[PDB]
Structure 1
Amino acid sequence: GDDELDQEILNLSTQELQTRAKLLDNEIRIFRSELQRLSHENNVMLEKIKDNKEKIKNNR
C-alpha cells in the first residue's frame, strides 16, 4: 500500500482517498470473478488427467 495514507493527503484530497478504496472494491469484485473462474478450470483439468491416466496404467 504505497497510497491511501499520509503520503497521499498531499497529492489529492482526503475524500479522494475515501472513495478510491471503494473503486478498488469494484475492481476486486471483478478479480474475484476471474480467480474463481480459474478455480473451476483447474478442478476440471486435474480430473481430466485422472480420466486419461487410468487407462494408461492399465496398459502399462
Structure 2
Amino acid sequence: LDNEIRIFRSELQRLSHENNVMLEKIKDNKEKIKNNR
C-alpha cells in the first residue's frame, strides 16, 4: 500500500486549498455585516 500515501496525500493537499478558500469568502461577508451594523 505504498501508492496509497503517494495518492491519498494528494487529495489532502487539495482540500486544504478548498478549505482556506471557503474560509475567506465567509470572512469577507463576516466583516461586511459589521460595516453595515
* TM superposition score category, shorter chain reference: 0.7 to 0.9
TM-score by length of 1: 0.55
Distance 1:25 1:43 in 2: 29
Structure 1 residue ranges without an equivalent (≥5): 1-23
Distance 2:6 2:31 in 1: 39
* Runs of at least 4 residues off by over 4 Å: none
Give the aligned CA root-mean-square deviation in angstroms: 0.9
Percent of aligned positions with the same letter in both sequences? 100
Deviation at 1:34, TM superposition (A): 0.6
Deviation at 1:53, TM superposition (A): 1.2
Structure 2 residue ranges without an equivalent (≥5): none
CA deviations on 1:20-40 (whole Å, 9 max, x unpaired) are xxxx11111111011111110
Question: Greater Rg, structure 1 or structure 2?
Answer: 1
Give the aligned length: 37
